[PDB]
Design a protein around this ligand. Structure first.
Ligand SMILES: C=CC1=C(C)[C@@H](Cc2[nH]c(/C=C3N=C(/C=C4\NC(=O)[C@H](C)[C@H]4CC)C(C)=C\3CCC(=O)O)c(CCC(=O)O)c2C)NC1=O
Ligand SMILES: C=CC1=C(C)[C@@H](Cc2[nH]c(/C=C3N=C(/C=C4\NC(=O)[C@H](C)[C@H]4CC)C(C)=C\3CCC(=O)O)c(CCC(=O)O)c2C)NC1=O
Ligand SMILES: C=CC1=C(C)[C@@H](Cc2[nH]c(/C=C3N=C(/C=C4\NC(=O)[C@H](C)[C@H]4CC)C(C)=C\3CCC(=O)O)c(CCC(=O)O)c2C)NC1=O
Ligand SMILES: C=CC1=C(C)[C@@H](Cc2[nH]c(/C=C3N=C(/C=C4\NC(=O)[C@H](C)[C@H]4CC)C(C)=C\3CCC(=O)O)c(CCC(=O)O)c2C)NC1=O
Ligand SMILES: C=CC1=C(C)[C@@H](Cc2[nH]c(/C=C3N=C(/C=C4\NC(=O)[C@H](C)[C@H]4CC)C(C)=C\3CCC(=O)O)c(CCC(=O)O)c2C)NC1=O
Ligand SMILES: C=CC1=C(C)[C@@H](Cc2[nH]c(/C=C3N=C(/C=C4\NC(=O)[C@H](C)[C@H]4CC)C(C)=C\3CCC(=O)O)c(CCC(=O)O)c2C)NC1=O
Ligand SMILES: C=CC1=C(C)[C@@H](Cc2[nH]c(/C=C3N=C(/C=C4\NC(=O)[C@H](C)[C@H]4CC)C(C)=C\3CCC(=O)O)c(CCC(=O)O)c2C)NC1=O
Ligand SMILES: C=CC1=C(C)[C@@H](Cc2[nH]c(/C=C3N=C(/C=C4\NC(=O)[C@H](C)[C@H]4CC)C(C)=C\3CCC(=O)O)c(CCC(=O)O)c2C)NC1=O
Ligand SMILES: C=CC1=C(C)[C@@H](Cc2[nH]c(/C=C3N=C(/C=C4\NC(=O)[C@H](C)[C@H]4CC)C(C)=C\3CCC(=O)O)c(CCC(=O)O)c2C)NC1=O
Ligand SMILES: C=CC1=C(C)[C@@H](Cc2[nH]c(/C=C3N=C(/C=C4\NC(=O)[C@H](C)[C@H]4CC)C(C)=C\3CCC(=O)O)c(CCC(=O)O)c2C)NC1=O
Ligand SMILES: C=CC1=C(C)[C@@H](Cc2[nH]c(/C=C3N=C(/C=C4\NC(=O)[C@H](C)[C@H]4CC)C(C)=C\3CCC(=O)O)c(CCC(=O)O)c2C)NC1=O
Ligand SMILES: C=CC1=C(C)[C@@H](Cc2[nH]c(/C=C3N=C(/C=C4\NC(=O)[C@H](C)[C@H]4CC)C(C)=C\3CCC(=O)O)c(CCC(=O)O)c2C)NC1=O
Ligand SMILES: C=CC1=C(C)[C@@H](Cc2[nH]c(/C=C3N=C(/C=C4\NC(=O)[C@H](C)[C@H]4CC)C(C)=C\3CCC(=O)O)c(CCC(=O)O)c2C)NC1=O
Ligand SMILES: CCC1=C(C)[C@@H](CC2=N/C(=C\c3[nH]c(C[C@@H]4NC(=O)C(C)=C4CC)c(C)c3CCC(=O)O)C(CCC(=O)O)=C2C)NC1=O
Lengths: 164, 56, 257, 177, 177, 164, 164, 177
């Protein structure tokens, strides 16, 4: 997994030296975002249950032809699966913004993602309409401070630059 | 029956030759595959002409 | 037509006499305008030798975290001696015999064409650039863990199936009863045992792979020896299919080992 | 060219193919009594929209409990899905008359219809009763012994093809029996 | 490795005798449908995109707990490596079909999968449910009774071809038991 | 180029051997198959402009949503590129018939086509729907032999099970 | 052991793929030769006990220095076991005509033959005499047909080119 | 690498054009003589061990200084390395004959071989006579004019490949000297 701690603890062992004083300077930088990033995790964990609907309804407005018969959303039960599908990606941004890195995403979300979408014919450009709608929705005065607006909005832009 | 093959069917057209025992270039015959639609319009006039409301 | 004539340029190579001239003036006139492209295609293949050795370390560092495969140190400063032994021997292998010069070239232009599974763009690069094919082999054969340090035995018999082939593989090292300079431990007063003390660290922790890392390497080594040595030798494939450490310790190059 | 005709249906995406004035003679040399056969399948597809209306309504006329609340001809989208399906057999058994064989009728239409209908709550004994109307309706159009409308043909007999389509509707009936 | 041409030479190495007009007649008939065997792998390579696809969905729509929390194919690191687990057994079976024997399959890949699967924790119980989804669609494309894709072949009997592909997949369950 | 001639000389080169007579059997299979394969390519060289126009009309009939803005068919210059993108395939299908193998296809058109189609938001679902219309309405006794209608149609579905 | 169609599938998994369209073009060509070559296997089959003793004493008619002691050809049962050593070279050259390729030849006739003929001092020139003694009398319109007559010798001179 | 069928489309790829009946007839005559082409490479592989052992003493019969002390061809190893050098540049021209194109030897054997012979001191005035000796033996086999070997071939002319085999030999010595 990727974080501030586990990345810099690797090069201590993989070069065969002690814990330095430069890696001790690195966890100090994790303290400056510990009370600055974790407010967004408790934000969305009590907020997904209404935004799984409005961001799940966001892509079908862009792509009404998924509900057409024949393609990957030609079943009221496929769309029951489709809402569960998008509740795994930002289920991991609650796991990513609690750790400090993209660890729960680069090993559980993108690894093998383009290969299960070509074979099972899921259009990757609808996930770009699914959770980037929340990027165009986010209000820094009302919802949460501009520290989540620079960090929760950053981790989403990691994903659109991965599913494309 | 999968999601792609559901209410799919052939459809065929017939234009016979004009006179008997003469060759006709206008005679032609379709065999186009076409998905049969839901046809809600004559569903209303058949249920209302037979029984009752149908509004469950 | 361009002008009153079209003579050849004086910048074209092989334009002067070179018949009864001095040695200084003979060599100046045969390499007239050829010096540029010799140095263009000398930094070309050295960049290719620098580029594929980067593209296989990306598997060694998946998603920005280092695995147990890197591990260049175990004790305090345990890479400084590994720094010298890797770069002093790289000069030792550049003063080899003139028979092993093209033996390295034509065999690197043998195995890489096999491993590049039918991609016509890729075999065209491996014929012009001998440094690229020397780097294509040792990068991929260390990316997929196949050479010597990671294919550990699991039975009790396979430690002698390893030991049967390798001391018979070192017929390539000793030409006769003399040794060679290609197989040298080191040249400092501790560097002999300083090669041993890392040699047991690199074998031990590489026996601590995951269940996925051993079960995916035990079939990649099998088909490796199945298209490098036993092209049709089904008896050698009868040990290469079920016993993969046999199919891995045998090295495809004439490494002089 | 019946195998190329069969690939328009079986290939799982819709194409189109049609027959001009030259290759209509290729079909008459291929299929035996094809001038009796193409007259027969034209006399089913030209009046199929009336044929599906009397088939579902005679099922109501001898069993009026389908249009009851809780019935399977209640809630008119469900009643429309009968009227979708009622021509789907007649689209495919017309195609069984055209190919001369009901192999393409079996796997594409009849295969799995027995387990689908008990999964959805279809009464199967009315479903044989619907198709038996359409078995009696096609042989009144092939023999032109229909009471209301009649068609224009060259004179002769077509009772072999009337028995040939009667060997196709009981394949629909015994699949859902 | 060794073919059906060599399968009587498997026996002939241990005969202290030869193969002549005693056993060529078993190999002579292999040539008489040698066009047929090359015609019956052209269906298998014609639907490579779907055969590993609907197989792994064939167990999801029956045993859906494998993608639950506590699953073996939970994330995309696992199930994208499950479609590579299920495709290369479609690969070493089509090499065995052109050889007439499992000499390619039973030694290159399946030589002891119960030290790479029980060493991982792979569910063997629904692996064989992931086998007969492909076997039932292998015999269904040997015959031209696939309800979606029809294929244009020369007519004839292929029950010896359809029974052979079922007798390749049977020892896969034996290699994991 | 992955032709049958190259595959039997590459294994001959790797074994350090001569041309053995086992490979000569495979060359005999070419001149039997070459007559029933070249006239699939000769009829394609005289029909390519009429077949590539008739292909793309079913691309926009099965998926008519591409004329929307943001899709890959909103303006005329890239609908012109769509016919060029699909003519390049049906030229490489002509090129591989003359070689006999799948050599030009999996090297020129195919290798690298996955990571540029999802890059530029092009679905492959409309790419495979273009040639499957071409591969279907073609009567095997009406245009060419009963052998070329098998061999050439075996090359068109090679694209579909490599793209899906 | 390398034959016509076990080779082209040994290279078909060497890239990690399926059979191609030219992979089947190779398997048509041995079918073009599975009649012209199986007659040549039958000619050796019902004549092998006539040719073991025919070409057997042929080499003994060459080398008179084996007939005196100082060799492994002193007594009778060596010459009986010599006629056994003839029978193995006709057992596997009959095998290659069944499978088409040089499969059974390279394994137990070609590879490893150097050690147990040179450290055992049984000269390879003595073997190539009786090998050519079968090769210098092919009666082409009498014993077989014209195409079996040219490829029967093409397997005969394989041990010529290897062992001598 | 690049055989004859690949060559005719790689110079037509820069055309951005199809390959129709203008140059396919030149390729249709290539597959006409393909039965004679397999009846040409059979005459080279069948006599390999003679003709490689031939010129290694036929070179020194003209130049006896190569066996002298201080010779390139002086010891047992430098001859044992010379004979295994000897059939490599003839197994590759057999590849070019069987594949119809010279694009397998000039990238894997003529790929800087004048580079390596200067690094060892291998003479080149001998290395081109040692392949011209092994050249006339290759036109005296595809045309049955050998004086100690006869291959039974049908009636026909073999000047089609007589200059073409030697065309795969004069390019050898030109790009190694
Ligand atoms: C491609 C081939 C193809 C067919 C063979 C038919 C078969 C068919 N019918 C229905 C589906 C149906 N069929 C009926 C029909 C009836 N129920 C009754 O009680 C009456 C007896 C009868 C009307 C006369 C109804 C009512 C439904 C809908 C079920 C529901 O909505 O609950 C479905 C729905 C499931 C799905 O979409 O896959 C299918 C495949 N349609 C096709 O597309
Ligand atoms: C492509 C469109 C196409 C068609 C629809 C048919 C139409 C058709 N049928 C027949 C000709 C005929 N058609 C029938 C058929 C019938 N007669 C009966 O009494 C039965 C009620 C009915 C069968 C269901 C018969 C019996 C003949 C005469 C014998 C024959 O030619 O087959 C003729 C020849 C008429 C003439 O000589 O001028 C034509 C054009 N043929 C076609 O090419
Ligand atoms: C004896 C043989 C002989 C030759 C073949 C030429 C070769 C040659 N060409 C150029 C030089 C050149 N040659 C070309 C030609 C081309 N570039 C292209 O884009 C096209 C592919 C192609 C012609 C259609 C160009 C564009 C230059 C560049 C001149 C410059 O750099 O200003 C030069 C360097 C300039 C000079 O020395 O004058 C030389 C030596 N000269 C010779 O003496
Ligand atoms: C310096 C020169 C240079 C090269 C010649 C290539 C050679 C090369 N190609 C790939 C990697 C690849 N190479 C190809 C190309 C092909 N595979 C096919 O199926 C086709 C037949 C063929 C193209 C014609 C593909 C598709 C991959 C990705 C799959 C893989 O990793 O094997 C890799 C590994 C990439 C990695 O480690 O991440 C390398 C070193 N790369 C280079 O840097
Ligand atoms: C309320 C009760 C009620 C019914 C019992 C049915 C009445 C009914 N009519 C037909 C029978 C038929 N139905 C048709 C169909 C048609 N005739 C045409 O000319 C048109 C083109 C087309 C739509 C009207 C034909 C051709 C027959 C056979 C001949 C006939 O009886 O008219 C049958 C099948 C034969 C049988 O009786 O077994 C039934 C059950 N409809 C009802 O509504
Ligand atoms: C050469 C011979 C050879 C094989 C026979 C297969 C067998 C095989 N499968 C897996 C490995 C696996 N195989 C599966 C597949 C499945 N698990 C399930 O729960 C389902 C039953 C099934 C999919 C339908 C999964 C989920 C993994 C683990 C993936 C991972 O390690 O993350 C591994 C370890 C890693 C790997 O190589 O993929 C091996 C060797 N692969 C080979 O290389
Ligand atoms: C190089 C590529 C290559 C191929 C793609 C195949 C193509 C192929 N298939 C068949 C030919 C055939 N294929 C079949 C097989 C079948 N028919 C059916 O109706 C069943 C559905 C199916 C059985 C599974 C039959 C029955 C024949 C006729 C030959 C025979 O009956 O033995 C023939 C012989 C026709 C002829 O030679 O004229 C050929 C060449 N062979 C090749 O060499
Ligand atoms: C070299 C590759 C190649 C192909 C694969 C085919 C494909 C093909 N078919 C047609 C053209 C056609 N294709 C059909 C379809 C069919 N025709 C029939 O007789 C059956 C009913 C059905 C096949 C079973 C029809 C009917 C036409 C003519 C257009 C029409 O009348 O509708 C055309 C346009 C040519 C024209 O203007 O007519 C093309 C390119 N032709 C080729 O050149
Ligand atoms: C050598 C072989 C070869 C190919 C296979 C193609 C592959 C290819 N296509 C496009 C580029 C494209 N390809 C398409 C094609 C399509 N989009 C759709 O709506 C349909 C699905 C489909 C037509 C049926 C479109 C619309 C673009 C333009 C996309 C863009 O440039 O942003 C590009 C980018 C460069 C360019 O635009 O020219 C490339 C390399 N080009 C090649 O040179
Ligand atoms: C334990 C695993 C094992 C291997 C992978 C190979 C690898 C190998 N091959 C050879 C040596 C050889 N290897 C072969 C290959 C073969 N000979 C045949 O008769 C077969 C057709 C084919 C597969 C067995 C040949 C022909 C030689 C002699 C040529 C040479 O020395 O290079 C040698 C050196 C000589 C020696 O064996 O002492 C070695 C180590 N040998 C092994 O012992
Ligand atoms: C399976 C391989 C196989 C063979 C190649 C032959 C080889 C062969 N031929 C003869 C036997 C013979 N061989 C010949 C020679 C010839 N006859 C002619 O018509 C030509 C002129 C010339 C062939 C080049 C003659 C004339 C005899 C019989 C009389 C004799 O010479 O003893 C014999 C001795 C046994 C006998 O009497 O037949 C043998 C082993 N037999 C075999 O079993
Ligand atoms: C003084 C030294 C000296 C020699 C050692 C011999 C060797 C020798 N033979 C040939 C020439 C040849 N060598 C062969 C080879 C063979 N012939 C056969 O019948 C067998 C099948 C095969 C040996 C196994 C052939 C076929 C020719 C051409 C015909 C001929 O001239 O003999 C040539 C080429 C002549 C030239 O340069 O044009 C030489 C040098 N000749 C010499 O002058
Ligand atoms: C698998 C291995 C394999 C082979 C070795 C060849 C064997 C072979 N060669 C020819 C057939 C032939 N071979 C030759 C060749 C020659 N004639 C001469 O006068 C010259 C000396 C020599 C020129 C190189 C000629 C001229 C024919 C007749 C066919 C033709 O002229 O095209 C034939 C056709 C005759 C027949 O069918 O019986 C066959 C099968 N084919 C194979 O499939
Ligand atoms: C050519 C003879 C030679 C070498 C080999 C290296 C060996 C080497 N690696 C080091 C140190 C080192 N090694 C690695 C990992 C390793 N490095 C990588 O570039 C990749 C892809 C790796 C995993 C496989 C890391 C991550 C470091 C820490 C330095 C850094 O990258 O920041 C250090 C410094 C140790 C220290 O700080 O005391 C040395 C001497 N040096 C040499 O002179």
């Amino acid at each position: 997994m990727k974080s501030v701690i586990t990345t810099v603890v690797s090069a201590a062992d993989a070069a065969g030296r002690f814990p330095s004083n430069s890696d001790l300077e690195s966890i100090q930088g994790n303290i400056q975002r510990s009370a600055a990033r974790l407010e967004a995790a408790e934000k969305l964990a009590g907020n997904h249950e209404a935004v799984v609907k409005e961001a799940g309804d966001a892509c079908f407005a862009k792509y009404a032809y998924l509900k057409n018969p024949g393609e990957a959303g030609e079943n009221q039960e496929k769309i029951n699966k489709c809402y569960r599908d998008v509740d795994h990606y930002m289920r991991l941004v609650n796991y990513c913004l609690v750790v400090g890195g993209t660890g729960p995403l680069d090993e559980w979300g993108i690894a093998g993602a383009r290969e299960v979408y070509r074979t099972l014919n899921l259009p990757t450009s609808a996930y770009v309409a699914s959770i980037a709608y929340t990027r165009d929705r986010l209000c820094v005065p009302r919802d949460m401070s501009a520290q989540a607006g620079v960090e929760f909005s950053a981790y989403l832009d990691y994903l659109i630059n991965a599913l494309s | 029956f999968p999601a792609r093959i559901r209410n799919k069917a052939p459809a065929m057209e017939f234009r016979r030759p004009s006179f008997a025992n003469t060759e006709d270039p206008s005679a032609y015959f379709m065999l186009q595959k076409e998905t049969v639609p839901l046809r809600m319009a004559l569903a209303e006039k058949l249920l209302t002409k037979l029984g009752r409301k149908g509004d469950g | 037509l361009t002008g009153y004539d079209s003579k050849s340029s004086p910048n074209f190579p092989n334009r002067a006499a070179t018949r009864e001239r001095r040695t200084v003036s003979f060599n100046a006139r045969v390499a007239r305008n050829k010096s540029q492209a010799k140095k263009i295609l000398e930094k070309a293949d050295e960049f290719f030798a620098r580029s594929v050795t980067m593209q296989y370390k990306a598997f060694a560092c998946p998603n920005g975290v280092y695995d147990i495969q890197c591990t260049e140190g175990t004790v305090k400063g345990a890479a400084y001696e590994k720094r010298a032994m890797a770069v002093s021997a790289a000069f030792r292998a550049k003063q080899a015999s003139p028979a092993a010069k093209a033996r390295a070239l034509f065999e690197n232009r043998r195995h890489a064409i096999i491993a590049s599974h039918e991609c016509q763009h890729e075999e065209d690069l491996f014929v012009r650039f001998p440094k690229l094919s020397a780097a294509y082999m040792m990068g991929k054969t260390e990316a997929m863990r196949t050479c010597s340090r990671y294919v550990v035995p699991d039975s009790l018999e396979e430690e002698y199936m390893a030991a049967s082939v390798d001391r018979q593989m070192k017929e390539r090292a000793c030409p006769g009863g003399v040794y060679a300079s290609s197989c040298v431990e080191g040249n400092a007063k501790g560097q002999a045992e300083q090669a041993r003390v890392a040699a047991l660290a690199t074998a031990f922790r590489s026996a601590q792979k995951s269940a996925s890392k051993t079960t995916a390497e035990r079939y990649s080594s099998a088909a490796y020896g199945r298209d490098h040595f036993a092209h049709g030798c089904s008896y050698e494939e009868s040990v290469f299919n079920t016993y993969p450490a046999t199919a891995a310790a045998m090295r495809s190059k004439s490494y002089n080992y | 060219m019946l195998d190329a005709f069969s690939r328009v249906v079986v290939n799982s995406d819709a194409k189109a193919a049609y027959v001009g004035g030259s290759d209509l003679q290729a079909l008459k040399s291929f299929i035996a009594d094809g001038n009796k056969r193409l007259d027969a399948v034209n006399s089913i597809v030209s009046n199929a929209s009336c044929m599906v209306s009397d088939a579902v309504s005679g099922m109501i006329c001898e069993n009026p409990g389908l249009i009851s609340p809780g019935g399977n001809c209640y809630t008119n989208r469900r009643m429309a899905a009968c009227l979708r399906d009622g021509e789907i057999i007649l689209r495919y058994v017309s195609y069984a008359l055209l190919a001369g064989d009901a192999s393409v009728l079996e796997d594409r239409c009849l295969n799995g219809l027995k387990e689908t209908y008990i999964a959805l709550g279809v009464p199967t004994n009315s479903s044989i009763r619907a198709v038996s109307i359409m078995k009696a309706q096609a042989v009144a159009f092939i023999t032109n012994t229909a009471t209301e409308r009649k068609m224009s043909f060259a004179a002769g007999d077509c009772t072999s093809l009337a028995s040939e389509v009667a060997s196709y509707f009981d394949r629909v009936g015994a699949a859902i029996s």
